[PDB]
Design a protein around this ligand. Structure first.
Ligand SMILES: *Cc1c(COP(=O)(O)O)cnc(C)c1O
Ligand SMILES: *Cc1c(COP(=O)(O)O)cnc(C)c1O
Lengths: 368, 368
């Protein structure tokens, strides 16, 4: 993780916010036996995987979730010893590496099942797996009771494999007017009924993401998987948080040039903006190679001195211009802030993408 | 740079293409005295700064360009010894570090001018600077003859500073129906006339980017600054290359799940796509945390087996679904390719952003 720079363009990350958000979530769970999994995929949703994991554990998280084995190995190499579940696919050729670093694996297909049966016969402590079930996200997971039984049963009865978990994922738990989450939950319980009729007991049943955790407490089961709201960001901006949470990331740049340009002057590539009068134009050392979306061209804004300054013309790779004509105290060197949810709204996306897109060129400053 | 992974999602980078592209550009220049600057900002436009710089030098580049001092320091730390120009702003507090690593600096403001005058008062050998002039990009640079003279003259006459260069940048050199590039060029020459009337001779006058280099050979002057087309990508997809170039980056993922889903099934978050009939849906281990634009949701495609497979529903952080129903030989494990220019077109952006957005989670495989 880049954590220093000679350029005043940076993401400030509050570790205390992350810790307190984990504690707030832990306190909110249906039962004290329910585990809090902190989901730190995508390099901690752009905040930094190791920083987010460490903070979340300090706040009471019980498990970590990542998307791919690479991310789990990164955590282990940084000295994180907490349980880690790879939520997505892990291929047969990667299984020995995963088991050697004590990484819990998601399984939903026979190629991985069969490789695991051969590999498990050659390992020290039991291998831990969670089985993924399909209930309506239309993404990954076994699809029928028959397939679940076919995939899980040989793993369950292998003397060196523990089927620790079984889970599903919700497509719209943030839509509080929809029956779909209850329908998915019913299908999930239907899968579970099938394995329990075959006397297979799985100790961690789980289905909730941030939205499920916040708004579907009846579905907390044995573990919840909190991602976006661990970072104090809403699953959907139409929602209001029912627990106390703080946004952990704030994105800043600064003014490195401040100039008056005459009426008729065009700004940036393609001359897509022409000044309607004399304007004071500030240039910032940030652009789309820092992850500032080019779709904010001629439509986004930054804040400074309690006012909004609109972006003029096209966002460049490394530089972006703003109009500070109505902000008389704007000066060379001023730091400015980028609103994360508003950038998502203006470009037709979600805060998840905005924070992940902050590129490796932008240092993260952990201010605690 | 990440260069290995347990997941089959990757950017293949042809070093031979980069080297040959640099050679092709070098051969095309107006005169053999004209220098080729390889622009490798944004981590070599997402290809890898060190790899791109090394390849370009091997192909005949004379100078390297980066956006910010961080990038120049990275190249020096990797053992690159070629001249490097920081094209954007460098702040007063960073000047000593830059000069100690023999980095050429762009200057266009008095804060940096005055700090330089005090610092140069130090240093082993002369400090090299280029002066940025504003001619119509509306971004950075001195704006008037008076300002140019005020900024440059004390630097020119300091016994330990060399004003090696003076430059400008074009807003629409890729627009071959516009007079603006010729107008900018005339303003640039007007700046140059002003300093030469004051008997200040600058050895490297430069103004061309990729588009200027390709289509405005009369403006090559002492050096051209080739970025996007060094990577074999067009400045604008409406253009055809007038010289021989090869696209250096190719982006791939793979099928990690292949399932038949019934009519009426919804795919991914928000149920934004529902199957109009029974479909074979493949899931790929790639999503917007890898830099795959979420704006490709329900509209982008990948290629496999000589056909296009459309993206179904929303791109997730780490996974994306495609329809392979009309591709009978699609199988678990198939690798698929993402078309870079078409992804830009479909999401209303440019190839520059697409290749820079490929995130640090995606390994670069250097093919040669
Ligand atoms: C991303 C993800 C989560 C976390 O979702 P949020 O909305 O970020 O809370 C949980 N589980 C799985 C399987 C995921 O992919
Ligand atoms: C980005 C940039 C270049 C290269 O532009 P391309 O279109 O990528 O060729 C050249 N000069 C300056 C100052 C730049 O910012």
């Amino acid at each position: 993780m880049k954590t220093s720079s000679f350029r005043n363009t940076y993401a400030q990350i509050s570790l205390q916010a992350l810790k307190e958000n984990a504690a707030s979530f832990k306190a909110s769970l249906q039962s004290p036996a329910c585990r809090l999994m902190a989901v730190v995929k995508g390099d901690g949703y752009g905040h930094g995987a190791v920083a987010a994991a460490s903070s979340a554990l300090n706040g009471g998280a019980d498990y970590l979730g990542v998307a791919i084995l690479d991310e789990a190995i990164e955590l282990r190499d940084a000295g994180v010893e907490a349980p880690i579940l790879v939520l997505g696919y892990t291929s047969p050729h990667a299984l020995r590496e995963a088991i050697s670093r004590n990484i819990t694996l998601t399984v939903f297909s026979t190629d991985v099942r069969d490789a695991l049966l051969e590999v498990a016969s050659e390992a020290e402590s039991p291998i831990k797996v969670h089985i993924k079930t399909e209930t309506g996200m239309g993404r990954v997971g076994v699809q029928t009771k028959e397939e679940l039984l076919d995939v899980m049963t040989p793993l369950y009865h292998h003397n060196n494999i523990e089927v620790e978990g079984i889970f599903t994922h919700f497509a719209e738990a943030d839509n509080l007017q929809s029956t779909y989450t209850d329908e998915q939950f019913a299908r999930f319980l239907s899968f579970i009924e099938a394995i329990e009729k075959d006397d297979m007991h799985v100790p961690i049943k789980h289905c909730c993401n941030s939205a499920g955790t916040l708004f579907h407490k009846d579905k907390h089961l044995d573990m919840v998987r909190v991602g976006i709201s661990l970072y104090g960001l809403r699953p959907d901006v139409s929602l209001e948080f029912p627990i106390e949470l703080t946004q952990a990331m704030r994105l800043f740049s600064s003014i490195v040039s401040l100039r008056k340009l005459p009426e008729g002057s065009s700004i940036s590539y393609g001359r897509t903006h022409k000044l309607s009068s004399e304007k004071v134009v500030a240039t910032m050392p940030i652009g789309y190679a820092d992850g500032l979306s080019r779709a904010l061209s001629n439509k986004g804004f930054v804040t400074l001195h309690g006012q909004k300054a609109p972006i003029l013309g096209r966002v460049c790779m490394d530089q972006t211009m703003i109009d500070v004509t109505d902000i008389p105290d704007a000066a060379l060197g001023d730091h400015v802030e980028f609103p994360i949810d508003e950038m998502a709204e203006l470009t037709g996306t979600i805060n998840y993408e905005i924070v992940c897109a902050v590129s490796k060129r932008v240092p993260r400053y952990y201010e605690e």
